[PDB]
């Protein structure tokens, strides 16, 4: 065969889903590009990894001019 | 169109400043007149607002649209802001280059007592 | 150009197929300010009716519960390969 190669899988996705209680610093979404965006009390690291900046429940929203998915946290 | 280029030039400040959840002092400049308003951290409701369009301030000045007028507004806003109970604020220049009238407004707002 | 037609009570995939496998097929009447009306009717008549070119142009008066409703055949669903009708949309 000419090919027969592949990389190791990266385990990317929504780790904590909407409504779930998360602790301050908990990773909510591992992904490549900002598919989801950082809302209230949610960060965005160098890897575009969205993480909780406060102890609370995760909230998925669909707002903005371009209709993007945002992840917020509400205590 | 110019306006639309000024809105997007401002947006980065606004969207960064609403994330922090800070009370922003918006300053809309115009060839004739200058405006200024202290807006609540939510962004919807206004707490304090003043301008050269207000007759109370317009009656005093020579011409409404210059550095000496901007100071008269900048003083007026910060004079109200302290009476309401506001002190710690942010300054949203609103896509206007921080140099002339807006600087004269900002420095007057600092010299009046408003803390930023 | 007059056909007697019953009112539907069961409606879905289970009912429709049971109906279609009983010499009949489902249709619907709709238009104007009134609510839509789901209408069961016989196959062998309406199959012979569609051969005439007037069917897809002229006004048909469908008889339901005594009342005669005036309609035009807007849209229609043929069975993929077998020569038979699945469903008709009667605009008012």
């Amino acid at each position: 065969t000419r090919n027969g190669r592949d990389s190791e899988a990266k385990r990317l996705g929504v780790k904590r889903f909407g409504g779930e209680s998360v602790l301050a610093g908990s990773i909510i979404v591992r992904q490549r590009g900002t598919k989801f965006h950082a809302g209230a009390n949610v960060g965005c690291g160098r890897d575009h990894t969205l993480f909780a900046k406060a102890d609370g429940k995760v909230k998925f929203e669909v707002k903005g001019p371009k209709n993007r998915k945002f992840i917020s946290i509400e205590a | 169109d110019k306006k639309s280029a000024r809105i997007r030039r401002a947006t980065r400040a606004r969207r960064k400043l609403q994330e922090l959840g800070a009370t922003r002092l918006v300053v809309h400049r115009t060839p004739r007149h200058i405006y200024a308003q202290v807006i609540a951290p939510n962004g919807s409701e206004v707490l304090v607002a003043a301008s050269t369009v207000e007759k109370a301030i317009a009656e005093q000045l020579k011409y409404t649209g210059n550095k000496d007028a901007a100071a008269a507004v900048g003083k007026a806003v910060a004079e109200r802001a302290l009476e309401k109970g506001i002190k710690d604020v942010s300054f949203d220049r609103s896509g206007f280059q921080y140099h002339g009238r807006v600087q004269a407004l900002a420095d007057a707002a600092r010299e009046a007592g408003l803390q930023f | 150009f007059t056909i007697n037609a019953e009112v539907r009570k069961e409606q879905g995939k289970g009912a429709s197929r049971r109906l279609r496998a009983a010499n009949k097929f489902p249709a619907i009447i709709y238009g104007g300010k009134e609510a839509p009306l789901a209408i069961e009717l016989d196959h062998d008549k309406v199959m012979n009716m569609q051969a005439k070119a007037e069917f897809y142009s002229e006004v048909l008066t469908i008889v339901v519960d005594g009342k005669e409703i005036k309609v035009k055949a807007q849209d229609v669903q043929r069975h993929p390969y077998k020569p038979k009708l699945q469903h008709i949309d009667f605009v008012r």
């Binding site: 065969t1 000419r2 | - | 897809y56 055949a73 993929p80 390969y81």
Partner: protein, 136 residues
């Protein structure tokens, strides 16, 4: 022999020819050869069935071909073991579900149409039927 002029990928998965067809109504011509059965028509079969039609109706009339291959079929050579790569693309096929109009015809009589579609229908693996363009 019909084939895509350049594609993204050379070799395609086998897949599963399921469901009903979409190109069901007779759109362009007056008559049409509808596929009753399920199957897959090769590039050769389509040409062979076209030649059988076009020669029956002579120079007159107009014919369409609603189906096109765009699916490469691979085949492993003779005296070759399993594995050691996906086989080489030999021929091209169009997957045909039930209901799919294959050929369409116009500018001929109804009497002479059916006879022309029999000659094509004989060439094809799939069981077919005659269909007329009904107005809505």
């Amino acid at each position: 022999m019909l084939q895509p002029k350049r594609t993204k990928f050379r070799k395609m998965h086998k897949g599963r020819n399921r469901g009903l067809a979409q190109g069901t109504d007779v759109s362009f011509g007056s008559f049409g050869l509808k596929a009753v059965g399920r199957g897959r028509l090769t590039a050769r079969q389509i040409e062979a069935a076209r030649r059988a039609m076009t020669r029956a109706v002579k120079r007159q009339g107009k014919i369409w071909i609603r189906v096109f291959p765009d699916k490469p079929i691979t085949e492993k050579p003779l005296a070759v073991r399993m594995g050691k790569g996906k086989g080489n693309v030999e021929y091209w096929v169009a997957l045909i579900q039930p209901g799919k109009v294959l050929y369409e015809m116009d500018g001929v009589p109804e009497e002479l149409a059916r006879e022309a579609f029999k000659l094509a229908a004989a060439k094809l693996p799939i069981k077919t039927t005659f269909v007329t363009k009904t107005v809505m």
